[PDB]
Amino acid sequence: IPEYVDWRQKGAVTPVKNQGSCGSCWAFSAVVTIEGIIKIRTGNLNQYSEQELLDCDRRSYGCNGGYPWSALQLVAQYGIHYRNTYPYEGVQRYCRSREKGPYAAKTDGVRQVQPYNQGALLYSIANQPVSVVLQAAGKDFQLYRGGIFVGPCGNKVDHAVAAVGYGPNYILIKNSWGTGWGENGYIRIKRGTGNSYGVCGLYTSSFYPVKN
């Protein structure tokens, strides 16, 4: 696998989004992996709807938090609409998928990468964007403006984001707090420290969609 991987350079990452006050990061995280696997398999780059996952995933708790893997399973059991046809409102509403007509994409399943193993995560990122979790409650993560993030932070994971690349000393992360945070909405987090948990708990639970 390469020394550097960056899926934005390969045309598989859409613009950075802002979730607002709503704790919908789980939906935002699932969507960037869907957007990425569709580009890799069909060559078409499209934006998909986080709002549809916020309203229709009833294993999650809307704006109070939820699960990246249930949103991904939902897209494999049913499908998802374009972002354009089901735009983001920032509040959980009624599941309006039937009213929006035919689904725009549907996946063949979801897989988990082997937890607490840096090599497993690098090998999946070199194949597609992956949904990852980390601890973001710390003041250091919140006030990050740029550079390689070394912490400090513990392992109490609370936020879902998407890994879209890596380099010799970092993993490239797309976050959903808009462009006014970090490196235009991205963070580069330190890798290669021998710590199995990952800095800020990055190797705790990682998932990706399958499309044949």
UniProtKB/Swiss-Prot annotation:
Give the disulfide map.
22-63, 56-95, 153-200
Instruction: Give a yes or no for keyword Disulfide bond in this entry.
Output: yes
Thermal profile, per the record?
Answer: Optimum temperature is 50 degrees Celsius. Unstable upon 65 degrees Celsius.
Q: Which residues bind leupeptin?
A: 25
Superkingdom of the organism of origin: Eukaryota
GO molecular function term, any single one:
cysteine-type peptidase activity
- Tell me which residues bind E64: 25
Q: What's the top EC group for this one?
A: hydrolase
Keyword line: Allergen, Disulfide bond, Hydrolase, Protease, Signal, Thiol protease, Zymogen
Which Enzyme Commission number(s) are on file for it?
3.4.22.2
Which parts pass through the membrane? none
List the coiled-coil residues: none
Report how activity changes across the pH range. Answer: Optimum pH is 4.
**Residue numbers annotated as active site:** 25, 159, 175
Reaction(s) the record says it catalyses: Hydrolysis of proteins with broad specificity for peptide bonds, but preference for an amino acid bearing a large hydrophobic side chain at the P2 position. Does not accept Val in P1'
Could you state one GO biological process linked to this protein?
proteolysis
Q: In the UniProt record, does the keyword Disulfide bond occur? A: yes
**Regulation (activators, inhibitors):** Repressed by the active-site-directed cysteine protease inhibitor E64 (L-trans-epoxysuccinyl-leucylamide-(4-guanido)-butane) produced by Aspergillus japonicus. Inhibited by the inhibitor of cysteine proteases from Trypanosoma brucei (TbICP, rhodesain) and Colocasia esculenta cv. Kaohsiung no. 1 (CeCPI, tarocystatin). Repressed by leupeptin, a peptidic cysteine, serine and threonine protease inhibitor.
Give the family, as the similarity comment puts it.
Belongs to the peptidase C1 family.
Q: What does this protein do?
A: Cysteine proteinase with a high level of diversity in substrate specificity, an amino acid bearing a large hydrophobic side chain at the P2 position is preferred.
The protein's name in its UniProt record: Papain
Which organism is this protein's natural source?
Carica papaya
Query: From the entire protein, which fragment is shown?
Result: 134 to 345 of 345
